[PDB]
């Protein structure tokens, strides 16, 4: 305990009071004097017609030209976005994939899902074809997100209510992150890769630290399970999409919400969220078959990326911000610009 | 195109490989195995030969069955049950000896799921002999207070089947009910005929004639 429960309740009340004391003015009351970006008419420049099953993940290369797409067909095809060509087609051991990653160096591609294993594949093998460099088996739940810190390091979000930092050289969990009440369904590494935020299914987004291994802040502002997350390019904010048909802009330093990108005509939950280079546009995917483009400072729909026959599961903006790639369940990876 | 002609050629050949893999993977009948913990799932999957997911693929009458034992996933279903669409059927196993509310609730939640509106669920009521012995030992009203009727084995089985079929609300799907005594290997022929019926129905629906 009773004393411990009372202490937890009073600590939560103090945290909420401190967070609400710093909200002198909302985002919409200070940026209301700028011109909106208007109708952002983006046309499908490329369409990756190579997958035959639902696309559940897609990641952009550091060169903004190669993109890896993972589908339930058991394949992880690396795409040439400039010429639509495919440079690799890796047959996965387990076809039940829910996440994929591309190393910033470009040598490695991750993969994970219901197999409880985050596999690492060596693209630049001297023997030609891609070989599985490691199979990280330490999770008791389904892997939901994986990001490369470097060629050797990797952080994984799993469905056993925890996140684990791995070591691809040895295969053992260097660091484990515990504290999520529900399933951790999203993860996004910061630009400096010194920290990351995991958006779990308990309507909370916990800010972790890779070096320290302990959580710093929790963001309990949503009303349903968080299905997507993405850092603001400045690295001091992030937008988390949930099943409540709203994606909110959380601030790390303010430690609270900034704007709720919700519309009265939207009931479908977010499945993918991604920012532009400047962060003004938040291309947040929806289960309503459209990847709406949200003005991050106006909280208004700048444009709609209609053209997907099924729910979009992964939206990815290039590192040079030239194009945005949306991977929906209709086995299509469309490139918009 | 200076040497991008070889790059295109590689893209085309691996696209042909992807197409061949897709053709070779569409022949496999995907069946999702669900049910309450310790409900004969291990026994029924062992009777058909061969940590999170345990795929048990096998071939029966020139038809490749892929049976997925996803009961080991210690997480909520709704965040990963959406990847199990396009499956032929959901195989449901219930131990009639041990009583039941969890099994019925999970059946109601899985049959009314938006993704599984069209995917008909195969229902298995195993431990029939053990259930009859328990009926001869204990009444069936322990877990069914509202069940009024004869206390025989046949009536109890009929009541359980009715209570399980009273959970779906979509006419496009049918629940196939089978009873097993945990000592017969003929539980796969029922699976085969149910799968063939579902394939016929899905093909008719896809042609617009159903």
């Amino acid at each position, epitope marked *: 305990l009773d004393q411990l429960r009372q202490e937890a309740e009073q600590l939560k009340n103090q945290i909420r009071d401190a967070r609400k004391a710093c909200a002198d003015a909302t985002l919409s009351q200070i940026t209301n004097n700028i011109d909106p970006v208007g109708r952002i008419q983006m046309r499908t420049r490329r369409t990756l017609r190579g997958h035959l099953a639902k696309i559940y993940a897609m990641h952009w290369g550091t060169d903004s030209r190669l993109l890896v797409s993972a589908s339930q067909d058991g394949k992880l095809i690396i795409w040439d976005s400039y010429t639509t*060509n495919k440079v690799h087609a890796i047959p996965l051991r387990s076809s039940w994939v829910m996440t994929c990653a591309y190393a910033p160096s470009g040598n490695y591609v991750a993969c994970g899902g219901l197999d409880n294993i985050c596999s690492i594949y060596n693209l630049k093998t*001297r023997e*030609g*074809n891609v070989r599985v460099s490691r199979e990280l088996a330490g999770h008791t739940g389904y892997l939901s997100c994986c990001r490369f810190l470097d060629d050797n390091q990797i952080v994984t979000s799993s469905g056993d209510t925890t996140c684990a930092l791995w070591d691809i050289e040895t295969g053992q969990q260097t660091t484990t992150f515990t504290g999520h009440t529900g399933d951790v369904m999203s993860l996004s590494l910061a630009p400096d890769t010194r920290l990351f935020v995991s958006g779990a299914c308990d309507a909370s987004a916990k800010l972790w630290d890779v070096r320290e291994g302990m959580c710093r802040q929790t963001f309990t502002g949503h009303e349903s399970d968080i299905n997507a997350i993405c850092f603001f390019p400045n690295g001091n904010a992030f937008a988390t999409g949930s099943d409540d048909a709203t994606c909110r802009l959380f601030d790390l330093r303010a430690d609270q919400e900034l704007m709720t990108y919700s519309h009265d005509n939207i009931i479908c939950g977010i499945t993918s969220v991604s920012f532009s280079k400047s962060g003004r546009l938040l291309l947040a995917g929806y289960d309503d078959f459209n990847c709406n483009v949200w003005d991050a400072l106006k909280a208004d729909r700048a444009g709609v990326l209609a053209g997907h026959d099924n729910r979009v599961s992964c939206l990815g903006v290039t590192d040079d911000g030239m194009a945005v790639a949306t991977g929906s369940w209709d086995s299509f990876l469309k490139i918009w610009n | 195109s200076a*040497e*991008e002609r070889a*790059a295109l*050629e590689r893209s085309k*050949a691996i696209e042909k490989n992807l197409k061949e893999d897709g053709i070779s993977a569409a022949k496999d009948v995907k069946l999702l195995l669900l049910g309450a913990d310790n409900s004969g799932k291990s026994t029924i999957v062992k009777q058909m030969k061969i940590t999170g997911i345990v795929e048990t693929h096998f071939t029966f009458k020139n038809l490749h069955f892929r049976l997925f034992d996803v009961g080991g996933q210690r997480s909520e279903r709704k965040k990963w049950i959406h990847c199990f669409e396009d499956v032929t059927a959901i195989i449901f196993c219930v131990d009639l000896s041990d009583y039941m509310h969890e099994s019925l609730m999970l059946f109601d939640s899985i049959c009314n799921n938006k993704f599984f509106i069209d995917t008909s669920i195969i229902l298995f009521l195993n431990k029939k002999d053990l259930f009859g012995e328990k009926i001869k030992k204990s009444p069936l009203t322990i877990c069914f207070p509202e069940y009024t009727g004869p206390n025989t084995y046949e009536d109890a089985a009929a009541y359980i089947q009715a209570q399980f079929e009273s959970k779906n609300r979509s006419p496009n799907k049918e629940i196939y009910c089978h009873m097993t005594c945990a000592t017969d290997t003929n539980n796969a022929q029922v699976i085969f005929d149910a799968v063939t019926d579902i394939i016929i129905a899905n093909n008719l629906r896809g042609c617009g004639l159903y």
Partner: single-chain antibody
Amino acid sequence: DVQLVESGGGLVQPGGSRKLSCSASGFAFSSFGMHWVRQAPEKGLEWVAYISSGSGTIYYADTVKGRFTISRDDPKNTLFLQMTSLRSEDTAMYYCVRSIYYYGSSPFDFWGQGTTLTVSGSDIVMTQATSSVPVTPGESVSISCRSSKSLLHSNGNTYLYWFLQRPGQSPQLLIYRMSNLASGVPDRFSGSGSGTAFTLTISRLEAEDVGVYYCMQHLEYPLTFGAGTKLELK
């Protein structure tokens, strides 16, 4: 390890035929485009034939087309080069070269040991003015190469390949596409160029780096090599 071994060499009477087999192991042969590069006993390298993965496109040299035959055996993981009507100009060592083609790939990366065979207009012309650069170890040696047609394609890829053939050894790729260092090559090698004027600047030359260097173009077949810049001690 990755290894290419050729066989089927020896003295051949003029006007006959012979089959040269390139056995391969340690790598995925089925997904590689195997080349056949010939080197005269006293002259530089010269491209002969090329075959891609799946035996889709087969190209040939100006003086080789119509007589030779390049084929693969993917299940046997061996490369073949059938040649008929051996003229006196075919007396040379035949090298086996692997090359995989995709975005960011490194063609011509691994060379075979080589087999010795003895018989008793619009193509890009690559000219190397410096045929001998005697430089002591510890100094920087730069080899220049020129092309009749600009090698810079529309997509920004300039196709100039630099090789190093140590005496008694097989050529080793150093820089591919005139800017990208090969796999395992020491970082001291630097590649540069613009359109036609290409230079392979080497820093801190060592005793093990003594050899002859070549420049190869891949903009359009046939792939023509240079005269060969030979580096000697002191």
